[PDB]
């Protein structure tokens, strides 16, 4: 069964206490989609993007 397998498949991350993540998101149609810019994390070290 699906619901029977649902504990067994998520033997990990499931039921871990949640934290607030700061990140910009958008809404496109019916989908909430996260958006990121990572040029900071590669220009500070002077490595090409």
């Amino acid at each position: 069964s699906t619901k029977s397998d649902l504990p067994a498949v998520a033997a990990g991350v499931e039921d871990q206490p949640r934290v607030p993540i700061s990140a910009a998101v958008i809404k496109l149609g019916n989908h909430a989609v996260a958006v990121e810019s990572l040029q900071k994390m590669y220009n500070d070290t002077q490595s090409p993007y």
């Binding site: 590669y42 070290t45 490595s47």
Partner: protein, 49 residues
């Protein structure tokens, strides 16, 4: 800071930059004139109106 990459390239050691910033001094001049007859009556106290 730097990044570790799985690529065969040599890792680069820790690095610091030490930067010196220097002052600028600016000079400003103004001029005033005072009459001698003007400075004359300032010391004495008037008696007639």
């Amino acid at each position: 800071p730097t990044i570790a990459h799985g690529d065969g390239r040599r890792p680069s050691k820790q690095r610091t930059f030490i930067v010196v910033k220097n002052c600028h001094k600016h000079h400003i001049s103004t001029e005033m004139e005072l009459s001698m007859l003007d400075l004359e009556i300032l010391h004495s106290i008037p008696e007639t109106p």
